[PDB]
Amino acid sequence: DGACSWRGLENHRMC
Amino acid sequence: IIGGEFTTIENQPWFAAIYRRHRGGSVTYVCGGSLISPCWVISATHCFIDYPKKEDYIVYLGRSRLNSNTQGEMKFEVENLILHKDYSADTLAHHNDIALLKIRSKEGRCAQPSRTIQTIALPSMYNDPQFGTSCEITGFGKEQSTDYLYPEQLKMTVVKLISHRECQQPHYYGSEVTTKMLCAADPQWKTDSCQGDSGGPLVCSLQGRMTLTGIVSWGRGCALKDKPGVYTRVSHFLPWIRSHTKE
């Protein structure tokens, strides 16, 4: 958990 | 993919592996995708929204391994990166989470069909299998929610379609899931798609035909109780797919 570990947040600036 | 089994590309010969080259030369894995026609790979907009520049991306077909070559693979530049205009990813749910990548090799060619590269059929409009139907998902995504690494080998699992009624429940996803989305999960929550699997195929047998029913989109954690995988409902996006595949 932590949204950056979820489907949806791949290849995102804030991750 | 949490749980499930290891596989090779000839068991999902439409699966596309999408990478981004970084300013500095380093290439990292982004998301999966599905070859739906020789020049068109279909994936999820959220994989690209923050870096919408087509020059950054490399697509492989016929690839079974993440960081080494597979014999007979084909490498592609992205001639066009088309994201859905009505995408929104405030809230947990990503709406209209669908994207198209026109593929072109350095030699100017699209996909050449082979033992390890074939296309997947789109569903007929608003035609989805009933809830409780078993479908398969494919990807290079995490094997554990806590993992740091992606697997080196392609993976596959089976999950069951969940009704909109069941998925809209407060103790599931509440209002976050729409009718343009499909929920799917394991009865024991022991297997699921996960981070890195996004954009990949949810494939169902629809009238004895293999069909791209869904595209891995979002979820809260992975293989968590009451938290199914959420997939873009492809049969609700056919006009969008039709028009944009002429671009």
Q: What is the CA radius of gyration of chain A?
A: 6
What does the alpha-carbon distance between residue B78 and residue B124 come to, in Å, rounded to a whole number? 27
What does the alpha-carbon distance between residue B175 and residue B153 come to, in Å, rounded to a whole number? 36
Helices (H) then strands (E): counts for chain B: 2, 13
| CATH 2.40.10.10 assigned to B13-119+236-247 | yes
Pick from A1, A6, A11: CB nearest B51? A11
User: Between chains, do A11 and B229 touch, taking CB under 8 Å as contact?
Assistant: no
Q: What is the CATH number of domain B1-12+120-235?
A: 2.40.10.10
Active site residue B236: no
- Residue whose structure tokens are 């026609």: B37
* Choice among B97, B128, B186, B192 that is catalytic: B97
What does the alpha-carbon distance between residue B4 and residue B157 come to, in Å, rounded to a whole number? 4
Helix %, strand %, coil % of chain B (to 5): 10, 40, 50
What does the alpha-carbon distance between residue B130 and residue B141 come to, in Å, rounded to a whole number? 27
Question: Which residues are bridge partners to B238 per DSSP?
Answer: none
One-letter amino acid at B98 equals I
Within this chain, domains B1-12+120-235 and B13-119+236-247 share the same CATH topology = yes
Please state the domain extents for chain B: 1-12+120-235, 13-119+236-247
What does the alpha-carbon distance between residue B50 and residue B47 come to, in Å, rounded to a whole number? 8
What does the alpha-carbon distance between residue B10 and residue B116 come to, in Å, rounded to a whole number? 5
Find the DSSP H helices in chain B: 164-167, 238-244
Nearest CA-CA distance, residue B197 and chain A, Å: 7
State which residue of chain A sits closest to B32, comparing Cα positions. Answer: A10
- Give buried/exposed letters for B25-53 (b at 16+ CB in 10 A, else e): eeeebbbbbbbbbebbbbbbbbbbbebee
* Choice among B46, B94, B236, B244 that is catalytic: B46
Q: Is B220 on the interface with A (CB under 8 A)?
A: yes
For an interface test with B, which of A6, A10, A14, A15 has the most B Cβ atoms less than 10 Å from its Cβ?
Answer: A10
Stretch 1-15 of chain A: residues touching chain B, C-beta under 8 Å: 1, 5-13
Instruction: Check the CA dihedral B8-B14-B15-B19 and report its sign.
Output: positive
Helix %, strand %, coil % of chain A (to 5): 20, 0, 80
Phi and psi at A11, nearest 5°, equal: 55, 45
